[PDB]
Symmetry: D2
Subunit: 454 residues, 4 copies
Amino acid sequence: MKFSNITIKNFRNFEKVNINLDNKNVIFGMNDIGKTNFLYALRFLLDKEIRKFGFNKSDYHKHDTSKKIEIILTLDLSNYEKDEDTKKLISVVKGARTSANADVFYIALESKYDDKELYGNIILKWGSELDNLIDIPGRGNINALDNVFKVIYINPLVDKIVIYLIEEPEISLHRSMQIALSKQLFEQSTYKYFFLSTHSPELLYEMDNTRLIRVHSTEKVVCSSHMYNVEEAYGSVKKKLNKALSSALFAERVLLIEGPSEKILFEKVLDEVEPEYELNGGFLLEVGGTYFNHYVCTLNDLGITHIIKTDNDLKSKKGKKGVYELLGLNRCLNLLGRENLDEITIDIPEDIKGKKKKERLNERKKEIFKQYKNEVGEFLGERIYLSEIDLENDLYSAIGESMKRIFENEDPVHYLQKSKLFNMVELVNNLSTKDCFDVFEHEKFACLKELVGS
Amino acid sequence: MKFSNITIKNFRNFEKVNINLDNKNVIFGMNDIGKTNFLYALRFLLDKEIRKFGFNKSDYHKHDTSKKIEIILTLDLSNYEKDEDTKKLISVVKGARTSANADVFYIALESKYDDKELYGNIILKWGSELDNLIDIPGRGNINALDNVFKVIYINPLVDKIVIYLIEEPEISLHRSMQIALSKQLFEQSTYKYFFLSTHSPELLYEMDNTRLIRVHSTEKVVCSSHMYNVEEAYGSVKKKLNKALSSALFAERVLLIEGPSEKILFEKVLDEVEPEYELNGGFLLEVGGTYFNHYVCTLNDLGITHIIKTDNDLKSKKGKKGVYELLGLNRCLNLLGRENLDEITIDIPEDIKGKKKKERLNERKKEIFKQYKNEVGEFLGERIYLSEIDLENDLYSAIGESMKRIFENEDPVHYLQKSKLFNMVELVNNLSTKDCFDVFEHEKFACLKELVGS
Amino acid sequence: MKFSNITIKNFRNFEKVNINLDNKNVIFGMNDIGKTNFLYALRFLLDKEIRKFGFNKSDYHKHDTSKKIEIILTLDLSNYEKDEDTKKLISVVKGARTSANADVFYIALESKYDDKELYGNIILKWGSELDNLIDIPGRGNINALDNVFKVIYINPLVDKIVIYLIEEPEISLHRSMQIALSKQLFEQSTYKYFFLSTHSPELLYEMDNTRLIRVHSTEKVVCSSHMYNVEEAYGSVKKKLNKALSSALFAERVLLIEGPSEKILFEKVLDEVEPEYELNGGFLLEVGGTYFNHYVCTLNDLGITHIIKTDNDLKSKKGKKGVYELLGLNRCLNLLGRENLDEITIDIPEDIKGKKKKERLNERKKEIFKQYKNEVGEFLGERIYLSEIDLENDLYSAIGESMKRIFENEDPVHYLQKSKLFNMVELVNNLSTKDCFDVFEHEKFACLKELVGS
Amino acid sequence: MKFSNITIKNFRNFEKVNINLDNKNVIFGMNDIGKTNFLYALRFLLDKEIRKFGFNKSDYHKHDTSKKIEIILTLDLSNYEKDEDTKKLISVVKGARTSANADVFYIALESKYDDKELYGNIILKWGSELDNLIDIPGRGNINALDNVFKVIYINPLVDKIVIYLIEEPEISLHRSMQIALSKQLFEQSTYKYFFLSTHSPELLYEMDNTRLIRVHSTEKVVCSSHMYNVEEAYGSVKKKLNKALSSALFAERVLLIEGPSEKILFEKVLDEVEPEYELNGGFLLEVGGTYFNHYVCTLNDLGITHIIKTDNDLKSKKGKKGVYELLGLNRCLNLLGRENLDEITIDIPEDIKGKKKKERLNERKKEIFKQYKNEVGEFLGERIYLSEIDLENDLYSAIGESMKRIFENEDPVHYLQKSKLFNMVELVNNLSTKDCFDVFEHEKFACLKELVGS
């Protein structure tokens, strides 16, 4: 009914590897040698045209031909009654099922080297316990395992359960057709069990209810796995979420921002300081009007460094007047595992408006920041950075001398707020190298120093 | 010194094709046969390891084995004294240069079929005029053309000028390394002459001073070419321009927007109306705070349908108070080839502020719109759409009944203005199929009827 | 210890074939396809690098994919205590040996088709009886049969018993190398079990103690076998016998003569009548001073037509004077399975000599011939022809009119008798087409009419 | 009209090789590398599909890439008016014929290395003199030479003049079909120009009017050639002449005998002395009733050692009585280039007959031998051996002690004469090793010590 785990011992570059699985699996990384071995590992266990030729000297670990090779596959058998496929793996097998309440099933493969003839044999056994495993009946060249499974292999560079193995279906396909392939794989019910390997981010636009395996750049002994499943909510904005995350899954360091105003400034600063930041990992990700939980959990389970920078903000509850909600603190606290805060009510006379209103709100926000220093201390530990009022004010504290030479006028922080995009473009046009060097080193913009590396 | 043109007559699927070129050339599209044929055609003229083997029956047009196969290459010879490479193509050639003031040079290739032996000979001829072409001297198996050029071929599926040919350098490369390859090709001087074929948009992140050739989906007889050159005024925003345009170059129809507020709404509307829009062409492009000339010229020269929807706007000139400029109207006139309009000065008493100020500005904008009916009528012809105030007011005229059931409050158009992102997310969460179909059919949103198709 | 028989049922072009064998076997004939299939038949039974791949549609009979394929090999197990290899085939097997006093052993191979998967399975079984055959134990990919035998394949165009299979070892070898190879195979003890296929007669110059298999030109249903073993009496003339018979084994019709005088005449007559007699089978073989048993038995066991023509002769027993022995008559009788006749004593006065003695001997020979008409008539039935005196007399009775025009003189038969080679050369020089046609039709030379054809 | 010679310089293993030729040529020997190179040498000069690819480092001599490669072919042009092929080679070429009375034509090929590009160019040049050679006109990829000749290559291991090149047509052919191929090659007029390479003696069963080329076992610098053309006076013994020389052409040491009586003795003697006499060359050849000139000239031109042993003999002239001729002495004098001797007349009374007649003739032969000692002295220099009476008498002088222990009786030399074959086969049976060692060393049998080697 469902795959559960796979254990590989002493096979090529695998020393002792334990990987969790599910019905739909997607593997990626920067190894390109372990990815092509993870599929031969599965083919030597469930395929016939490749098991006839036994192991050779190279197929072991680093040419130490005195150790065993074990491969074990674990399957969960719970729907004893309503499952259509559980009957087939309970009718062909009739003696390894000691009890009618086993709920687990195993398949194993062992190999021991024969020095005299330069040949390594393959022996297959299954059972329902780790201690009592019995051999597969079968006469001639056909085992009893081949009567249950059928394996199909797809590679463009050249009444049974069907298992698909696709390798790199993007060699000579246009960008449009990759989306069609993704839709077919992840939506229609033609495919149920498969494993997939890819280097392009256009195959993962409709990913849902699957498992993701990431391979680190180091020795193959490390592989990480996570279960991806979107919620019932966040269902009206699924396309944007997947389009944002599909490219960040291929990185090593990712920074989360709010809007396109910060993208221009950060791109200019990085270009002036060091231009080769996207070659050595690195990425900039836009979140928008959504909480950070979905990105953070997915990135943390796969060992991806994550950096978050945000600003304090206030919203007015609909209907009621004079009552405000703390959104910036709530979004940062919801990630550490805590509860929302009570609303704060503030009073402003009707006559006061404009900059007088803005300064009152800024003073209130500064007081709120003053009250919760201990929380900010714990926020900064887990790569969460919070500003006092906004980004523009922190910018004014680093390049303020050069701010009053382009806009002239007065109070340039107020001048930017009128139009965020055009005036930021004007500001970035008229900036020297010294200004970017000064921005890159100030404390309030420390987050960038963690994107480039230690 | 510089390539200028290439003419192909009766070679495979080419009937009569005339393509402009330059030193750096990039070819792309959806017709995969035509690109391979183009690069083979370029090899029967400058490489000896492929010209030994003459033409066969298939190498002609649709097996009409009675027509000539002619290929002519055109080169411009202007730097008669300063170029270090013109001397080489004036030293080896000594008779075709009738006058020391030619400024143009040709290379030609002709072939006629020999029925008796089933073979097609290849005859080579250069000259400096189209009427007087002489034969190339050479004894044995080596021509005089091979003493000037050397051709190098790269394909991962396997004292002289050097010409590089690259075919699909992304078959098994990670995402990071494609950027490094793009940098090396487009910045360093190791490569000076090359032709490239690609399907991935990450190779075109540093493109500058090149020619782009697009191949349509129809018969190969159609191919379009354009010269890409970024100005010195749009510097420091180059890295974002290229990342925006590199994906749009692979489409057949593109819509231009302003910010991320419109992306969410349009994605939801399209998802409810018809979910397969990015497969049959289709793309959404973000512009930001920049004029539309750079995108529009590039997209028009290559035969890509372009759609523009923008809103009216005003700005306050720095320093002077009470004077405003017409940015939205101006940005739609530079594209038609006209001059900027004169500033408009308006007066508002100091006491009046807030919503009363906003209604005064809206009345002024409506009055401005009331005087330029002919301009808007001419704008709409070239696929440019203008709204009276902004997108939200246009939205209120179609789904107004459902606006006052989520936010409640009053005058929800003002409510959205407080926070563009969060409130639009809340709006899109609470919407039904009927609401989206009502947006898709209204007149004031006619733009979406051209991105879907005809 | 010794192979005994092999039975093939429904394999390619074999319908029901039963072939006797021995330790050393040599296969030849005109049908190359059958000689190639006869070795795959053994490889599918004793080799594992070819048995992994099961049967296909073609490997059956004429695409009737509903019949069994049975292959049985029979081995004789008698040297229970003296043989050093009977132990290895009595220790590995421990349950199929029902009694310790059994002589024969069997190895069988069966296959039944599986229509659903398009694959035929191979099942192996031995036993010491034809009614009770058990399955061979083995786990994984290794049977118990592979622990006893090892098969080696040799083809220039590319503690266990060893079986060699040699195919066409004369592709690019010189003549002396062929003779050396023949010596190595048939003399030294390095090779003990092998099967050999050949098209050249130089490998068979010292064949001794072997089994010869001949393949007819018709359907494979016919194959003939004979055990070749030379006697100890014919040990001083072994080389000449083998060199004479090694070329005749590749024919379909063979004629036996006495010496080189009977070769020139027959070659001239055949050349004048029809010059294509060696393409369509045919051969002339010289015997000399031996008996005909050795050639006749070997040729008759392999289905080769044999023709014998001889002349009556008398020779004197050493020591005793006046006593003569019947040689030709006894040599013809020894082939039908009878006993030698008694000596005949004749008296001649000392004075009588010269031609008178010759005419007396001729009269005596004529009387001896007249005594045995029934014996001559029984000789003629089994392709044995006997002349009254000699070939010269029959040639005279055929062409005397032309014989008395070259030698002139008188009694030309005597003139031939003085010197045989030179006078026969002179005679054959001066002959016409009419004379040769006259020789070919006379009754006394009927033997030639049987060599050419029916 | 006729090929005449070929000169190869500095090509592979050829240093300076000069070979004569004709229309039909057959090449053989032991050096299997030179035989292939001799046929690639004729394809770089006349074949288009192999000359496109230039020389490499290996195609030179022992990797010394600073010397020229020249190939010249010589063709005789005499039938200026009657030949239907001389017109073609005088019409296509129209400027190299300085005079209409040249009678000789040349074709040449030169090549000089180009170190920079690692390539060797091929330049072609014909002419009717060795001093004035002009270049061959032609534009593109087709020369003027390709309009006259066409080349065909045959190898089973895979209005123009046609040249065939056959390589080893005996790989998988039956013995009967080789004769069929020989008849077509050497009789019918379909083939006129060809070269042939072979290892089997059955292809040369009808050779007439050809050239034979033999390659020695040493370095390729040695190659011998001869013209084979049978006379019209040997036309009735042709089918037998070529069935004995064909096998001898593959040897290095050949001995000539008269009949099978000597074969029986010599085979046993050699078997007892040393059995591996046929691996290291060596062969016995029967001549019969013909002169030795035809064999001796053919074997001498090809550098084959020849040994001749003959016995004295007398014959009676037809018609006349009492007059005798000296056949044996004349057959040895004819080969040294002399004239036949006069007849000798001897008288014998009618009464004397039988053994007395034989002893009178033996005394006469002994006197004749005594007369001509000087001639025998010169005969023995050129490997011609003569005996006084016969082989039997010389045998009696070496093993006489053992002669009178098998036949007993008396005068065993007379006893053998009555029936040579049946008594020699009995003598050979009853002979010990010491008896055979005593024939191999005696002076009268010095011929056997030169066959085995020095």
